[PDB]
Structure formats: structure tokens, C-alpha cells
Coordinates of C-alpha atoms and ligand atoms in Angstrom, one line a residue:
X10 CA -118.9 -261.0 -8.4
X11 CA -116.0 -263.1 -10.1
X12 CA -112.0 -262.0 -8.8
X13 CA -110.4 -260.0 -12.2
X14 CA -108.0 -263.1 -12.6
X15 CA -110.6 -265.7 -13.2
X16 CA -112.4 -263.2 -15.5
X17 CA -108.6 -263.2 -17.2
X18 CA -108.7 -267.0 -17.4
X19 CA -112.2 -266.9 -19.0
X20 CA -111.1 -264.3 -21.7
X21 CA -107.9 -266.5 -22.4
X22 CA -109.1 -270.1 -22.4
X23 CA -111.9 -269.0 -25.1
X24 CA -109.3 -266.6 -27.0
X25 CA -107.7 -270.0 -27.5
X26 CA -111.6 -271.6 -28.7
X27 CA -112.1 -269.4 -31.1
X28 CA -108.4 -269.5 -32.5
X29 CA -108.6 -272.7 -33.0
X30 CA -112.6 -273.6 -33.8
X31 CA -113.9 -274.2 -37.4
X32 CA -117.1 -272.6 -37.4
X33 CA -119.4 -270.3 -36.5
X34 CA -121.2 -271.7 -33.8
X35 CA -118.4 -272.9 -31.4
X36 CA -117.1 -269.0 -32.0
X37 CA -120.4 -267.3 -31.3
X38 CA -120.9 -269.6 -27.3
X39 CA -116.9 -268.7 -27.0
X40 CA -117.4 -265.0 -27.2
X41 CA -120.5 -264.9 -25.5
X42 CA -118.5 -266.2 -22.9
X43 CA -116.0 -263.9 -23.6
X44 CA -118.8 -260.9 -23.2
X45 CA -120.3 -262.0 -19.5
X46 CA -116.7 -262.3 -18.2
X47 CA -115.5 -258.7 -19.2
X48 CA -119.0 -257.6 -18.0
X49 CA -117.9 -259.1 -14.3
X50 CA -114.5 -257.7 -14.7
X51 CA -116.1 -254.6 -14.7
X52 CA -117.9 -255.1 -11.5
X53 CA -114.5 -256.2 -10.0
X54 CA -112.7 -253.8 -7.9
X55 CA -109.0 -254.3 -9.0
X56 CA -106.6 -254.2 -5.5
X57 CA -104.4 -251.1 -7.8
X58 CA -107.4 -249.3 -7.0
X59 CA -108.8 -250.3 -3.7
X60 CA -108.6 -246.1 -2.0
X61 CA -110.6 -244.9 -5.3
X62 CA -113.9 -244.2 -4.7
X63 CA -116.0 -246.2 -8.0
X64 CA -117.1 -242.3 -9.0
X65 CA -113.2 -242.0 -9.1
X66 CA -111.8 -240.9 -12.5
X67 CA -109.4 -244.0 -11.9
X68 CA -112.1 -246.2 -11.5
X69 CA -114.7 -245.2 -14.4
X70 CA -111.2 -245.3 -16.9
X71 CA -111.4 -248.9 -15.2
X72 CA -114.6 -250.0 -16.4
X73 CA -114.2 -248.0 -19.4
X74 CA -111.6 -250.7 -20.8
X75 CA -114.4 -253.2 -20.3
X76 CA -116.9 -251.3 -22.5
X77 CA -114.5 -251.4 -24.9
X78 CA -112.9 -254.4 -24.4
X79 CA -117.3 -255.4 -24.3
X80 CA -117.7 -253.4 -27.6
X81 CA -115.0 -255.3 -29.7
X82 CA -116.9 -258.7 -28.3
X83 CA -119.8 -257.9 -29.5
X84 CA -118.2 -256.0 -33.3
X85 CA -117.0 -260.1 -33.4
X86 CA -120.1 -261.5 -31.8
X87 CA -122.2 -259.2 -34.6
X88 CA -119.7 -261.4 -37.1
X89 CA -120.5 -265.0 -35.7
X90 CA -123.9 -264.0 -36.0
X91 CA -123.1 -263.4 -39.4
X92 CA -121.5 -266.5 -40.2
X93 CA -118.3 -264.6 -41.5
X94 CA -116.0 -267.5 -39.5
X95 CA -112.7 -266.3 -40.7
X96 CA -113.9 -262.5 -39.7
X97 CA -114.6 -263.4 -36.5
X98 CA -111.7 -265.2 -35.9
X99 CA -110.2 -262.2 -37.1
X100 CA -111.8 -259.6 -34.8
X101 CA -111.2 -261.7 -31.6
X102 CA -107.9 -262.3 -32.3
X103 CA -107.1 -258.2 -31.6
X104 CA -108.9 -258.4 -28.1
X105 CA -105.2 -260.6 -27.3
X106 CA -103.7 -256.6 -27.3
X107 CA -106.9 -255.4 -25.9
X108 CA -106.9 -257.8 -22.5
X109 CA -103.3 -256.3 -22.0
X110 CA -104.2 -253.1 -21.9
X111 CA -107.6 -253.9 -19.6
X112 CA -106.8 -256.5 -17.7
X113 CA -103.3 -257.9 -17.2
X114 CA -101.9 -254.3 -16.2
X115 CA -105.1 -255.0 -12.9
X116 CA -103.8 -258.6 -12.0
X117 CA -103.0 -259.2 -8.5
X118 CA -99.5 -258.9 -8.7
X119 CA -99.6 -255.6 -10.6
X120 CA -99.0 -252.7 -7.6
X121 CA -99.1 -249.0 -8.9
X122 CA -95.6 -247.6 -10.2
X123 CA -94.6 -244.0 -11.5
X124 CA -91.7 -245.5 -13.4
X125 CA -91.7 -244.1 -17.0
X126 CA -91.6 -245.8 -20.5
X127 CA -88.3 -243.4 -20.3
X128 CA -86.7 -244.3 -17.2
X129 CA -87.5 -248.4 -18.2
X130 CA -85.7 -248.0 -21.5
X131 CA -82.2 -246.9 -19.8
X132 CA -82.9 -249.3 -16.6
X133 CA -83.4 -252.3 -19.4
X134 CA -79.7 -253.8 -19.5
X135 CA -80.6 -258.0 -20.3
X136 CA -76.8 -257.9 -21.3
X137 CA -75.8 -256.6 -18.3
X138 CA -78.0 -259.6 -16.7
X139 CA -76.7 -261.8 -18.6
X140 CA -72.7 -261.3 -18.1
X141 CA -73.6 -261.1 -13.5
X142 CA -75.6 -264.2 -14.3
X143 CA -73.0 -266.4 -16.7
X144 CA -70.1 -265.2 -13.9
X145 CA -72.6 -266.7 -10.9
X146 CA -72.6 -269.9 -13.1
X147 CA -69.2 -270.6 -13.8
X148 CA -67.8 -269.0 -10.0
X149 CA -70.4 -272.1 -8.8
X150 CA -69.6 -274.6 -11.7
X151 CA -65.8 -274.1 -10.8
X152 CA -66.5 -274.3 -6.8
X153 CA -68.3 -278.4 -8.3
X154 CA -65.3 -278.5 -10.1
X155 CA -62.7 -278.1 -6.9
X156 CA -65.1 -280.2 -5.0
X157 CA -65.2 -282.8 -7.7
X158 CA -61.4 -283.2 -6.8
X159 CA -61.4 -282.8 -3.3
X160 CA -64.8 -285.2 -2.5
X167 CA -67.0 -287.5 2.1
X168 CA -67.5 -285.0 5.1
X169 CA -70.7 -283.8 6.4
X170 CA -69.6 -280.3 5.7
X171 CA -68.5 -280.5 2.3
X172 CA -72.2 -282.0 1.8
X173 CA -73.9 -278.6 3.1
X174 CA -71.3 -276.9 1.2
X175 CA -72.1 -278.7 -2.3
X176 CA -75.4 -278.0 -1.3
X177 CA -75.1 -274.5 -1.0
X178 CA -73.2 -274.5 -4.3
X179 CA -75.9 -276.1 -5.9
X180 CA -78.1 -274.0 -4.6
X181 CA -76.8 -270.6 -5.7
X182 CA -76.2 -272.3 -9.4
X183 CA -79.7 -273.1 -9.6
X184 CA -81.0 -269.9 -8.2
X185 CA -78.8 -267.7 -10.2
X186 CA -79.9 -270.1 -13.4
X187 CA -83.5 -270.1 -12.3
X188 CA -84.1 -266.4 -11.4
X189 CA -81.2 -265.1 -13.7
X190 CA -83.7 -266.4 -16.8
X191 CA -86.7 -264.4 -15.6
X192 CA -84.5 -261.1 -14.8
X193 CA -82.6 -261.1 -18.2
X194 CA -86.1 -262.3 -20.2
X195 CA -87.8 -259.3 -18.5
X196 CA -84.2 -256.3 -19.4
X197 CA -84.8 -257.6 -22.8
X198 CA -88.4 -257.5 -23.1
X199 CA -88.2 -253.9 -21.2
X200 CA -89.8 -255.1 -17.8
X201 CA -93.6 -255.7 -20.1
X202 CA -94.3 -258.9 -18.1
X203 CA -96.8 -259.7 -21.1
X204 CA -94.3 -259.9 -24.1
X205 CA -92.5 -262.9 -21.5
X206 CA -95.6 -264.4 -19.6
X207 CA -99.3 -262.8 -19.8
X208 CA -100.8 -263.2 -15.6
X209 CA -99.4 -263.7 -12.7
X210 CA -98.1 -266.9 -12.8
X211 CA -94.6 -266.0 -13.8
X212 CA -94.4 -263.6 -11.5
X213 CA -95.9 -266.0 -8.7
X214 CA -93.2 -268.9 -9.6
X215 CA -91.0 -266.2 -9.2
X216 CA -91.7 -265.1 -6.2
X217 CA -91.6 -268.6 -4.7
X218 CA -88.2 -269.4 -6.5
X219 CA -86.9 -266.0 -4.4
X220 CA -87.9 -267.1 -1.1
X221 CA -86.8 -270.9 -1.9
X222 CA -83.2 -269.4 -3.3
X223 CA -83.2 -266.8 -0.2
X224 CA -83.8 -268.8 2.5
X225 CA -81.8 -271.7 1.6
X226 CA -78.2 -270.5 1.0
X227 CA -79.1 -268.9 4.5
X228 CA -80.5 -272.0 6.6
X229 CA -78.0 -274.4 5.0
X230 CA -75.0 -271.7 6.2
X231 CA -76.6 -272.5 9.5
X232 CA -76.5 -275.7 9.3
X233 CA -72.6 -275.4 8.0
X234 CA -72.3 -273.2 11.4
X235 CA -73.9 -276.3 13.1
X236 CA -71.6 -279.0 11.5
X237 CA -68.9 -277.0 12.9
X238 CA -70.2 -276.6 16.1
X239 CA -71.2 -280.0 16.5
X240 CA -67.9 -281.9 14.8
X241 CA -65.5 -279.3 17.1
X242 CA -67.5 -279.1 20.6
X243 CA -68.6 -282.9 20.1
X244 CA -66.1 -286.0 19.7
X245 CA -63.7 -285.6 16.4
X246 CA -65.9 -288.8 14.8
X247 CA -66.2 -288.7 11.2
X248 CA -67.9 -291.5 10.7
X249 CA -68.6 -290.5 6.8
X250 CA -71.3 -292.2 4.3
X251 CA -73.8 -291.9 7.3
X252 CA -72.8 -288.4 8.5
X253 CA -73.1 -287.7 4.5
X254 CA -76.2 -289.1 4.4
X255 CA -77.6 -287.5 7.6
X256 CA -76.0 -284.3 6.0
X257 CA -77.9 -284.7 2.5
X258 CA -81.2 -285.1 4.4
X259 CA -80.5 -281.8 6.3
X260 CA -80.0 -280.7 3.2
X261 CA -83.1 -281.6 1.5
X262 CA -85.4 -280.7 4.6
X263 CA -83.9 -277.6 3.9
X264 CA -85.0 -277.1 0.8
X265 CA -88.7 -278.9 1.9
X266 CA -88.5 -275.6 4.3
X267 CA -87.5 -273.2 2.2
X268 CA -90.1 -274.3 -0.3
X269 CA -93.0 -274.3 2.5
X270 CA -92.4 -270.6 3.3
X271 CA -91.9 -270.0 -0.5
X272 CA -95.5 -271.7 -0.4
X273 CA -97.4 -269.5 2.3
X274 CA -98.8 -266.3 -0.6
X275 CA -99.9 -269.0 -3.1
X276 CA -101.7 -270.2 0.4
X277 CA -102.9 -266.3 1.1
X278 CA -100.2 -265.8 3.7
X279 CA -98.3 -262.9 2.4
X280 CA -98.1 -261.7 -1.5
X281 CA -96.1 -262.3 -4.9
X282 CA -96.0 -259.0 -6.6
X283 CA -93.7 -257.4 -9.2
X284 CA -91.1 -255.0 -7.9
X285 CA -89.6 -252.5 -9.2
X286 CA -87.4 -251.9 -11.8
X287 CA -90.5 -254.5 -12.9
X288 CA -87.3 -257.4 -13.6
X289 CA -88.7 -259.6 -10.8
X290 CA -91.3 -260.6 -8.4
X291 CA -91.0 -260.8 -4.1
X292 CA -92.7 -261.0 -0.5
X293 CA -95.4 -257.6 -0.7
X294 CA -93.6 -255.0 1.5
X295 CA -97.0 -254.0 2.6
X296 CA -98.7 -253.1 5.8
X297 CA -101.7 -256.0 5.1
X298 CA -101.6 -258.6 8.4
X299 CA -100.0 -261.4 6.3
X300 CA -97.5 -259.0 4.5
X301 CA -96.3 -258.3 7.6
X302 CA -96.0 -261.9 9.0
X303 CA -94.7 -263.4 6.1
X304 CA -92.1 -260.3 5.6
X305 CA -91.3 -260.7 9.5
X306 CA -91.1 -265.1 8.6
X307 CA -88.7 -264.4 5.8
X308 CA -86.2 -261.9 8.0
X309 CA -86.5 -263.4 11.3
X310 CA -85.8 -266.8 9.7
X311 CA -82.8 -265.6 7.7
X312 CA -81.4 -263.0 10.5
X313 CA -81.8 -266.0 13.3
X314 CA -79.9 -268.3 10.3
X315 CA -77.2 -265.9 10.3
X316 CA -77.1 -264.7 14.2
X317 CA -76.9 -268.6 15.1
X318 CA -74.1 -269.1 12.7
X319 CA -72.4 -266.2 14.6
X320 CA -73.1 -267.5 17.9
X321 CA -72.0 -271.3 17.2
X322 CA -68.9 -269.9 14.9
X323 CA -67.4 -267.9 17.4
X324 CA -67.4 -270.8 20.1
X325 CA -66.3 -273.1 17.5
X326 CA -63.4 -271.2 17.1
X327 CA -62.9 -270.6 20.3
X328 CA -62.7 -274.1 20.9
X329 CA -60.2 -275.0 18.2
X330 CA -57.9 -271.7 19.4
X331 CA -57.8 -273.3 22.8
X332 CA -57.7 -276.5 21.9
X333 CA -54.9 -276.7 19.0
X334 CA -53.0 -274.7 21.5
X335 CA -50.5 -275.6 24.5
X336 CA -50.3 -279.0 26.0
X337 CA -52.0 -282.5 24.7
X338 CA -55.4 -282.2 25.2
X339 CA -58.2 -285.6 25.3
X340 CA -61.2 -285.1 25.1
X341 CA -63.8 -287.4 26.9
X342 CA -66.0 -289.7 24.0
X343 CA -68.7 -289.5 26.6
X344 CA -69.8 -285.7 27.7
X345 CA -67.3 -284.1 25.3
X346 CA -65.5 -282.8 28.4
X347 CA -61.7 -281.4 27.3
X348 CA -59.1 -282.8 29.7
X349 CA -56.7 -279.8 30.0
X350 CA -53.1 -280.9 31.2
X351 CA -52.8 -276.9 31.7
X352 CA -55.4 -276.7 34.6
X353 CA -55.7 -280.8 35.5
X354 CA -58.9 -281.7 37.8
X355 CA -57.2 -280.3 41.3
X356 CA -60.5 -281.0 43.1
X357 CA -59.8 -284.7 42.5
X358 CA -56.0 -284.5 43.0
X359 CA -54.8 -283.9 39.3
X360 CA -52.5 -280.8 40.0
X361 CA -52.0 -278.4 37.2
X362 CA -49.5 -279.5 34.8
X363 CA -50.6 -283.1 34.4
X364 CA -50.2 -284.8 31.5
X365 CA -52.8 -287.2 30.4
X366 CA -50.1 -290.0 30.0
X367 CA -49.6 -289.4 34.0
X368 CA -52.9 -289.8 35.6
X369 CA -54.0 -292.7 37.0
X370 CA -56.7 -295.3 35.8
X371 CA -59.0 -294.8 39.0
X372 CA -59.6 -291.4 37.3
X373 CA -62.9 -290.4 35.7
X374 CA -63.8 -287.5 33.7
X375 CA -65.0 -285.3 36.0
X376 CA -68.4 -284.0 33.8
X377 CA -69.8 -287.4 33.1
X378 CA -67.8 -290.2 35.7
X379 CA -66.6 -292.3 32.8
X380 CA -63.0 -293.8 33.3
X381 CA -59.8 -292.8 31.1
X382 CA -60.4 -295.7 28.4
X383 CA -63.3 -293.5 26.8
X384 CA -60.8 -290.7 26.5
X385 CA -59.6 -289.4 23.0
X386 CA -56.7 -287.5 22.2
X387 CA -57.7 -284.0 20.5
X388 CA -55.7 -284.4 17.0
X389 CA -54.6 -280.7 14.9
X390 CA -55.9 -281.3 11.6
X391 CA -55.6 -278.6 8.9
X392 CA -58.7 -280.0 7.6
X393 CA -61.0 -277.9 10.7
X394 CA -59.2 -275.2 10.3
X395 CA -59.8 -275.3 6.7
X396 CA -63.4 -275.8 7.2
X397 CA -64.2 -273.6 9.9
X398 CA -62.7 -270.8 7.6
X399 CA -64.8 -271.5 4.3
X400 CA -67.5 -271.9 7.6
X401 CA -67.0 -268.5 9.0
X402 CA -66.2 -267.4 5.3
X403 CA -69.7 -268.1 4.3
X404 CA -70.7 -266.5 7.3
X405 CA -69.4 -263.4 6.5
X406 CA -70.7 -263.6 3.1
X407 CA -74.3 -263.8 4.4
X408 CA -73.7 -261.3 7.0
X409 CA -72.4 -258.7 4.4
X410 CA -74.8 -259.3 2.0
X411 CA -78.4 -260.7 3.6
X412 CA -78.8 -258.7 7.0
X413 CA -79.4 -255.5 5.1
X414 CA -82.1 -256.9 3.1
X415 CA -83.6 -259.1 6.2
X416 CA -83.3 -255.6 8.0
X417 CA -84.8 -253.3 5.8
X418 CA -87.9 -256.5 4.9
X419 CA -88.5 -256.1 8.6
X420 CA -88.5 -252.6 8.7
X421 CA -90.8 -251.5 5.7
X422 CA -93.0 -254.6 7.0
X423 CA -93.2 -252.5 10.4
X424 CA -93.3 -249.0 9.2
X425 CA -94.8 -246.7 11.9
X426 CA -96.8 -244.7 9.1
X427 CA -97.6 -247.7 6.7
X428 CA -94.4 -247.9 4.0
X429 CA -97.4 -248.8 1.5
X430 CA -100.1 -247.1 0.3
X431 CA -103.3 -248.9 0.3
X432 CA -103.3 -249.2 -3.8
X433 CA -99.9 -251.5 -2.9
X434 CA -97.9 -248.1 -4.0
X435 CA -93.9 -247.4 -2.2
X436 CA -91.9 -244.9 -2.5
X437 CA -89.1 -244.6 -5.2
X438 CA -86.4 -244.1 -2.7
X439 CA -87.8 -247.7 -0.6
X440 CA -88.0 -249.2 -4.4
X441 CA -84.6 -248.1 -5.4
X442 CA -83.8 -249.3 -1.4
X443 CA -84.9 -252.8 -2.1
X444 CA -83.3 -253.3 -5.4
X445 CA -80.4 -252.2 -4.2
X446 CA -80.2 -254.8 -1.0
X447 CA -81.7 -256.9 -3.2
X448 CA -78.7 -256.8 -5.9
X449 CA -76.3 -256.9 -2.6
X450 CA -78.1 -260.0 -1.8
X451 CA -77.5 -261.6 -5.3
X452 CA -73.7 -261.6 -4.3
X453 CA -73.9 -264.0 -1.5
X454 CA -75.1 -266.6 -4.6
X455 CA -71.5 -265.6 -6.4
X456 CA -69.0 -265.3 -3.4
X457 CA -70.1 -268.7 -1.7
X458 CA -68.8 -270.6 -4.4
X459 CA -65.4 -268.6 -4.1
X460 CA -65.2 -269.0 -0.3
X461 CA -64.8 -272.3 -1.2
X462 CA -62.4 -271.5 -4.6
X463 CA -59.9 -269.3 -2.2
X464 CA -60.2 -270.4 1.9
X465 CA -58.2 -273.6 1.1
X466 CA -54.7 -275.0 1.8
X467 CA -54.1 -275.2 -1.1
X468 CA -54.3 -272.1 -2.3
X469 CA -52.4 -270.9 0.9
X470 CA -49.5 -273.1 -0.5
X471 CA -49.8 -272.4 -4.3
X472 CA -50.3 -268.7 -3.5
X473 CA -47.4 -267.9 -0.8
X474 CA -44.3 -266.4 -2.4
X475 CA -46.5 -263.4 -3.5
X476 CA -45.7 -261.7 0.4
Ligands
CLR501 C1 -91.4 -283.5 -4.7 C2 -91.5 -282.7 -3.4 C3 -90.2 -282.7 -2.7 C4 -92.3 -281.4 -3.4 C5 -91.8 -280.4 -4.5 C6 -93.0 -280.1 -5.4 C7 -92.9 -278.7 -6.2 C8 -91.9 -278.9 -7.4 C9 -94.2 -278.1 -6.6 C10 -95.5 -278.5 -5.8 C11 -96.4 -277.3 -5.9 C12 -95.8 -276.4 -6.9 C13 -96.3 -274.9 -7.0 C14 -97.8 -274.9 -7.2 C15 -98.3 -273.5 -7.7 C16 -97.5 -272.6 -8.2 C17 -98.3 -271.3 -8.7 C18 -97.9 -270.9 -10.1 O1 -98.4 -269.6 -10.3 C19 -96.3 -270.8 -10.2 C20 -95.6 -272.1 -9.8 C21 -96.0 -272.7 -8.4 C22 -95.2 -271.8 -7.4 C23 -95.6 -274.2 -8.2 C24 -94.0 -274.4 -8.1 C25 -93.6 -275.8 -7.9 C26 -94.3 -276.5 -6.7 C27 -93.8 -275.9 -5.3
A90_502 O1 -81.2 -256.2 -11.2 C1 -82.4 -256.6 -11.3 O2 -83.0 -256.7 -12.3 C2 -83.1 -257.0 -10.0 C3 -82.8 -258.4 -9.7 C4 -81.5 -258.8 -9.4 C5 -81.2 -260.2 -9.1 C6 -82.3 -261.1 -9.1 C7 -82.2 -262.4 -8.8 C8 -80.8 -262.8 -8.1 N1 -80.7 -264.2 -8.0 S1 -80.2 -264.8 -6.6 O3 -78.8 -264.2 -6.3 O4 -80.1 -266.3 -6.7 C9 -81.3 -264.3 -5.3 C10 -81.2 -263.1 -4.7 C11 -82.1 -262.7 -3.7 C12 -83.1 -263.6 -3.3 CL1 -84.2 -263.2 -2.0 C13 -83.2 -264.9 -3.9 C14 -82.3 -265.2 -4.9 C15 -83.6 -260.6 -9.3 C16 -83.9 -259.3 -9.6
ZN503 ZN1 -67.3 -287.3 30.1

């Protein structure tokens, strides 16, 4: 047998035939394609029903749909055969309703819910949608706007980036969500099949992962631009920083790639305003679910790692004496402990060593040394860096958590029809909609962690 989806297909690319077709005979071999399709549907064994047994009372109301959906082909196959053309155009133009109710409901990324026609009418808020969206949008807009003034550094790149990124992911997945509250979650009314849902659920994976890896690659910047010689040698660091950038989002688009390629699952989740990963039990469920969270966890622990040294480094650095750092090996030449083992005594200044002195990490002489400059600029940075940080931390680890915990579920967090529980669907949205904020507060990391702002924003204390 034929997979319920390309059945679908069938019944939709000759719905469109006959709509369009002039006479009789073009409607009759449209239909009758129409008629061997919902015949193989029927065989099909939808994956919302896959613990029914086929005697199942689930299962024979299954195949029931196709005798009907079979008996209105044939009331408009009895009409073609009757030459009655605008009839029969007539009578197949209802079986648009009919698929809905037999088929589109079984599509792949249809799991079971026991969510009421009731509790969807109150939970349908596409105003509400709207107003979260708009304010992501202009927060983001005005972060471009600030930047516009300010910008050249490879940090600023990632963080345009990352602006850019939460704009178009609150544009792109904002549309969807506020389509679906005002069409009161009926994916058909918006987009009949899957493919909505699908491109939805690669657009959450690209717009997840990305704010994520390229906050790790802010962490990075950071790390590298404090630990590493104070070179700024813009225009290629910029454009070494927009290629990050872009294999980024090549990344984030791969993984968002891997259910379309059968590793892992796009399904709708509840309130039924969206599509994600499956939080399933099934072998790529788990390993994509486990991809997603290990890859943004790791994203955020090795921002925490490199953050905390990278502060660390500018506290002890743009503190005490004058410190220079070697060009070479990075090495920082502290006048506060000197190289004692190589008779620089404690207390030497830089200005008093001698030239037949060489950085003790790497053996290169004093002409490679650099003095380590304060610049409010790092310090600015680094906090809009560990601001971001923060913002990730807050609002991603609980979802990357809880993905890797339903994903790993001692007894399976999924029933084998796809069903979860209403408290791990009201879980998810919930760390999902906590998730949503790190796409509204990066832009403001940027807005508020600047000097500016310090200075404008003082004589309030
Ligand atoms: C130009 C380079 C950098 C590559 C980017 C190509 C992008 C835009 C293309 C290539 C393959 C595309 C995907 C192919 C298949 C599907 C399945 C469909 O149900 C929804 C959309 C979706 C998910 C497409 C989204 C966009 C996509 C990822
Ligand atoms: O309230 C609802 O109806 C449920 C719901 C809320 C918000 C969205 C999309 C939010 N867009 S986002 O912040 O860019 C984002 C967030 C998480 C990921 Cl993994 C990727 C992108 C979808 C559904
Ligand atoms: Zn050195």
C-alpha cells in the first residue's frame, strides 16, 4: 500500500482537475483516480492509530470515512458518466470538506489530542499573538537602529546577527502562530497537509538553535579578542565574523533539515498554534530531541565557561600595575609577580626590564610585547556578551532540559499513537513561551548594557 499523504496528494492534485476541466471525460479519469486513492487510504494504517488493533472501533471509523469519502466519488463518478459536467463539478467540489474530515486530521504530523472545541476557543488569542510579536519586532528593529549609529567589530557582527535573527524568527513563526489563534488552531482553514506545519517545524529549529550557537560564538569573540592579543584588525575580522555567522545558520538549517530527512519528526503541538521536534520515545525522536538540547545546552555551557575566564581576565587585567601582554603566546607580563625564576623580582615594571629578556611562555624578546590598554569598549561588550548569556540561560536551558528529559523518559513520555500528557503539553508550551523571550530581550541587552545609557541614565540613584 500507498503512505495516507500521497493518497492526500492524489485526492488534491485531481480536486484541482476537475475544478478546472471543461468536460466530462477529463472529470470522469480525474475521479477515478480520485476513487483508487481513497480505496488505498483505506488500507493505510494512519501513525494516530498505530496501538489499535484494525477490528478496533478506532480503526473501522477510519476506513469508514473512506467508504464515504468512496461513496461521494462514485455519487459524482455516476454524474460524469452521465455527462452532467457542471454536476459533477459540483459534487466533487464537497469532497474539499470531506478530505478534511478523512484525511488531513490522519496526516503525519497530526498526533492524538484531548483538547476540546471548548478549551480551543478561550486558548485562541491571534491578538494577543499579535501585540508579543509586533513588541519582538520593534525591541529588534530598535536594537538595528542603535547599531545603525554605533557601526566594525567582530562582535557587533554576531550581535547584528543575532538581532537579525530573532526579527526574522519572531516575523517568520509569529505569522504561523497568530494565523493559526485566529483561525482557532484548524491547521486546514490556514494550510491543508503537513507542509506548513513541516516548514514550521524547520523554521523552529533554525530560529532555536541559532540565537543559541551565535551567543556562543559571541562568548568565543570574547574569549578569543580578551585571552588573545587586543588586534582588531576590522573589515577581515568582520568578514571572518559574517561567515561564522552564516555557517551558523548553514548549521542550524542542517539540523532543522534531519525530520524532512527521517531523523526525528515535525508534528503539531499543542495548543495546535505551532509545529516542533516529536517528543517521542521513537529512536530518531530521541536523537534528534537529544541533537537539539545537547547542541543548545553545550552553546550555552561553553558560553559560561569562556565568559567567566574572559572576565576573569579583564578583572585582573584592567586592575593594578601596567600590564603587556606578549603578541606571541598571549602570555600577560605582570609587574605584580615579575618572572623571578629569570631574575625579574616582584614589582618590576615593564619599562625596567632589560632587552636580553624574553617572555618566558614562548622565548620571544620584549619588542613583541604589547601594552594591555583599558578600553570601556570590552567592558561594554563582555556585558551585552554575558547579558546574552544570561538571557539564554534564563530562558533556553529549561526547554533544552525538559526536550532531553521527555526524549529520555524511563516509562516512554509518549504513547505509541504519538499521544502526551496535558500537564507535559502545558510543560512545553510553557518553556516554549519562556523560550520566545530570549528572541525579545537580546535585542534589549544591546538597547540597555551600553555606556551610554550608564551616562544618560545616572542621576536617577
Ligand atoms: C542557499 C543555501 C544557503 C541553502 C538554503 C536553501 C533553503 C532556503 C531551502 C532548501 C531546502 C528547503 C526545504 C525543502 C523542503 C521543505 C518541506 C516543506 O514541507 C516545507 C519547507 C521545507 C522545510 C524547505 C525550506 C527551505 C529549504 C531549507
Ligand atoms: O503561544 C503559542 O501559541 C505557542 C507559541 C509561542 C511562540 C512561538 C514562536 C516563538 N518565536 S521565537 O521566539 O522566534 C522561537 C521560540 C522557540 C524556538 Cl525553538 C524557536 C523560535 C510558537 C508557538
Ligand atoms: Zn610569548
Amino acid at each position: 500500500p500507498a503512505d495516507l499523504e500521497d493518497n492526500w496528494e492524489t485526492l488534491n492534485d485531481n480536486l484541482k482537475v476537475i475544478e478546472k476541466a471543461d468536460n466530462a471525460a477529463q472529470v470522469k479519469d480525474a475521479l477515478t483516480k480520485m476513487r483508487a486513492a481513497a480505496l488505498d487510504a483505506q488500507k493505510a494504517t494512519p501513525p494516530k492509530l498505530e496501538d489499535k488493533s484494525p477490528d478496533s472501533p478506532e480503526m473501522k471509523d477510519f476506513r469508514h470515512g473512506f467508504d464515504i469519502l468512496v461513496g461521494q466519488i462514485d455519487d459524482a463518478l455516476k454524474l460524469a458518466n452521465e455527462g452532467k459536467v457542471k454536476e459533477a463539478q459540483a459534487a466533487a467540489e464537497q469532497l474539499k470538506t470531506t478530505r478534511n474530515a478523512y484525511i488531513q486530521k490522519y496526516l503525519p504530523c497530526f498526533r492524538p489530542t484531548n483538547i476540546t472545541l471548548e478549551e480551543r476557543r478561550l486558548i485562541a488569542s491571534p491578538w494577543f499573538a499579535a501585540s508579543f510579536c509586533v513588541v519582538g519586532l520593534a525591541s529588534n528593529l530598535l536594537a538595528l537602529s542603535v547599531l545603525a549609529g554605533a557601526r566594525r567589530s567582530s562582535f557587533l557582527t554576531f550581535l547584528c546577527g543575532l538581532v537579525l535573527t530573532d526579527f526574522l524568527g519572531l516575523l517568520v513563526t509569529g505569522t504561523i502562530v497568530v494565523s493559526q489563534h485566529a483561525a482557532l488552531f484548524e491547521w486546514h482553514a490556514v494550510d491543508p497537509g503537513c507542509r506548513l506545519c513541516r516548514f514550521m517545524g524547520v523554521v523552529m529549529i533554525f530560529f532555536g538553535l541559532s540565537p543559541l550557537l551565535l551567543g556562543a560564538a559571541m562568548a568565543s569573540e570574547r574569549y578569543l579578542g580578551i585571552t588573545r592579543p587586543f588586534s582588531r584588525p576590522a573589515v577581515a575580522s568582520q568578514r571572518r565574523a559574517w561567515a561564522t555567522v552564516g555557517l551558523v545558520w548553514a548549521a542550524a538549517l542542517a539540523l532543522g533539515l534531519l525530520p524532512l530527512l527521517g531523523v526525528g519528526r515535525y508534528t503539531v503541538q499543542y495548543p495546535g498554534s505551532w509545529c516542533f521536534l516529536t517528543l517521542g520515545a521513537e529512536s530518531g525522536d530521541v536523537a534528534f530531541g537529544l541533537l537539539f538540547s545537547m547542541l543548545g545546552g553545550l552553546s550555552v555551557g561553553l558560553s559560561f565557561l569562556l565568559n567567566t575566564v574572559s572576565v576573569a581576565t579583564l578583572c585582573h587585567v584592567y586592575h593594578g600595575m601596567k600590564k603587556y601582554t606578549c603578541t606571541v603566546c598571549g602570555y600577560i607580563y605582570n609587574p605584580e609577580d615579575g618572572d623571578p625564576d629569570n631574575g625579574v623580582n616582584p614589582g618590576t615594571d615593564f619599562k625596567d626590564i632589560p632587552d636580553d629578556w624574553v617572555c618566558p611562555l614562548c622565548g620571544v624578546g620584549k619588542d613583541q610585547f604589547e601594552e594591555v590598554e583599558e578600553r570601556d569598549s570590552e567592558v561594554e561588550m563582555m556585558a551585552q556578551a554575558l547579558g546574552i548569556m544570561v538571557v539564554a540561560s534564563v530562558c533556553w536551558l529549561p526547554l533544552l532540559v525538559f526536550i532531553a528529559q521527555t526524549v529520555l523518559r524511563n516509562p516512554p513520555a509518549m504513547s505509541p499513537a504519538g499521544q502526551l500528557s496535558r500537564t507535559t503539553e502545558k510543560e512545553l508550551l510553557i518553556y516554549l513561551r519562556v523560550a520566545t523571550w530570549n528572541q525579545i530581550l537580546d535585542p534589549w541587552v544591546y538597547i540597555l548594557f551600553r555606556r551610554a545609557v550608564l551616562r544618560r541614565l545616572q542621576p536617577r540613584l
